[PDB]
From a paper:
Here, we describe the chemical synthesis and folding of a central, cysteine-rich domain of the cell-surface receptor tumor necrosis factor 1 which is integral to binding of the cytokine TNF-α, namely, TNFR-1 CRD2. As this central portion of the receptor contains a significant number of TNF-α interface residues,11b we envisioned that it can be synthesized individually and serve as a truncated mimic for the TNFR-1. Cell-surface receptors, responsible for converting external stimuli to cellular responses, are critical targets for physiological investigations as well as diagnostics and therapeutics design. While recombinant routes for preparing receptors are most frequently used, chemical protein synthesis has unique advantages for research by offering atomistic control and fully breaking the barrier of chirality.
Here, we present a synthetic route to the TNFR-1 CRD2 protein domain using a one-pot chemical ligation and refolding procedure. As the linear TNFR-1 CRD2 polypeptide contains six cysteine residues, there are 15 possible combinations for disulfide bond formation. The highest refolding yield (33% by HPLC) was achieved by preparing a solution of TNFR-1 CRD2 (0.5 mg/mL) in 6 M Gdn·HCl, 0.1 M sodium phosphate buffer (pH 6.5), 6 mM glutathione disulfide, and 60 mM glutathione, which was then rapidly diluted 5-fold with 0.1 M phosphate buffer (pH 6.5). Subsequently, we conducted racemic protein crystallography to analyze the structure of TNFR-1 CRD2.4 This technique involves crystallizing small proteins from a racemic protein mixture to gain prompt access of high-resolution structural data.15d,17 Here, enantiomeric TNFR-1 CRD2, prepared entirely from d-amino acids (d-TNFR-1 CRD2), was synthesized following the protocol developed above with an overall yield of 16%. The racemic TNFR-1 CRD2 mixture was subjected to sparse matrix crystallization screening, and the best crystal-forming condition was identified to contain 25 mg/mL of protein racemate, 1.5 M sodium chloride, and 10% v/v ethanol. The crystal structure was solved at 1.4 Å resolution, confirming the correct disulfide bond patterns with well-defined electron density. The TNFR-1 CRD2 structure aligned well with that of the entire receptor TNFR-1 in complex with TNF-α,11c showing a backbone root-mean-square deviation (RMSD) of 0.36 Å across the cytokine binding interface. The binding experiments with human TNF-α (Peprotech) showed clear binding to l-TNFR-1 CRD2 (KD ≈ 7 nM), with no binding to the d-counterpart. Consequently, this indicated that the TNFR-1 CRD2 is structurally conserved, and its binding to TNF-α suggested that it can serve as a receptor mimic for further investigations.
Author numbering: 72 to 116
The structure:
Amino acid sequence: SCSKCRKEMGQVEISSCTVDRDTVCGCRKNQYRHYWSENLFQCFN
């Protein structure tokens, strides 16, 4: 499966899933991340 970005974490799609890379998710330029676990992060203003 390709991954989806977590809207409830405020994530946006950066790059789409290709044959050789999963979906890349991130935040907007003025935000920063908090990692709740290795994989799960949230975007804050």
